[PDB]
């Protein structure tokens, strides 16, 4: 298990434009195209992202390319985020993956919104952080996924992903 395998489990892989859990146009492995209601706008984003005129469909290789970019960006971003660096630097590799997962899903802003939980994490108060994380729109809207991430934070193991 690693960040890629983990996110691949959580986001799936779709080669044609689809709508994510929030109703937003997305493609590949959870690559958000735009929050716009416009399919045309989403297709324009796609083309720009890939570098060609696609008509809403990409190859797997293409999908993995955006995915690789997205995970890298996720990491790079956290590493230069003040609200997040310290807590992330404080974590072990497993829990770091969980943190990266949440940023990929919701963005730095969204993740920094979890101030209290982050703090318990920084304190290494595992169960407390776990409880706190669950008190969120995030957990209510994506409970299965949220529960998986929370277990990782709690335990520092990949068990929750262990057979997905």
Q: Which residues are catalytic?
A: 11, 20
Residue with Cβ nearer K ion (116 or 141): 141
Residue with Cβ nearer K ion (30 or 49): 30
- Picked from Cl ion, K ion, none, the partner binding residue 30 (CB below 5 to 8 A depending on kind) is K ion
Q: Which positions ≥6 away from 4 have C-beta within 8 Å? A: 67, 71
Beta strand pairing status for 31-34 and 25-28? antiparallel
- DSSP states of 47-104: HHHHTS--TTB--HHHHHHHHHHHHHHHHHHHTT-TTTHHHHHHS-HHHHHHHHHHHH
Q: Which positions ≥6 away from 56 have C-beta within 8 Å? A: 16, 17, 27, 39, 42, 43, 46
- Picked from Cl ion, K ion, none, the partner binding residue 28 (CB below 5 to 8 A depending on kind) is none
Q: In this chain, which of 3, 6, 46, 49 binds Cl ion, going by CB under 5 A?
A: 49
Binding status of residue 145 toward Cl ion by CB under 5 A: yes
- Picked from Cl ion, K ion, none, the partner binding residue 3 (CB below 5 to 8 A depending on kind) is none
Query: Binding-site residue total for K ion (CB under 5 A)?
Result: 2
Site string for Cl ion, 125-144 (x = CB under 5 A): -----------------x-x
Binding status of residue 26 toward Cl ion by CB under 5 A: no
- What is the binding site for K ion (CB under 5 A)? 11, 30
């Amino acid at each position: 298990m690693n960040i890629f395998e983990m996110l691949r489990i959580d986001e799936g892989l779709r080669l044609k434009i689809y709508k994510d859990t929030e109703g937003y146009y997305t493609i590949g492995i959870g690559h958000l195209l735009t929050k716009s209601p416009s399919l045309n706008a989403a297709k324009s984003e796609l083309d720009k992202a890939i570098g060609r005129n696609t008509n809403g469909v990409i190859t797997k290789d293409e999908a993995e390319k955006l995915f690789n970019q997205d995970v890298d960006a996720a990491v790079r971003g956290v590493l230069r985020n003040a609200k997040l660096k310290p807590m992330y630097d404080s974590l072990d590799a497993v829990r770091r993956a969980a943190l990266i997962n949440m940023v990929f899903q919701m963005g730095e802003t969204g993740v920094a919104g979890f101030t209290n939980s982050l703090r318990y994490l920084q304190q290494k108060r595992w169960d407390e952080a776990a409880v706190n994380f669950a008190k969120s729109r995030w957990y209510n809207q994506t409970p299965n996924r949220a529960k998986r991430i929370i277990t990782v934070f709690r335990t520092g193991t990949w068990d929750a992903y262990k057979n997905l």
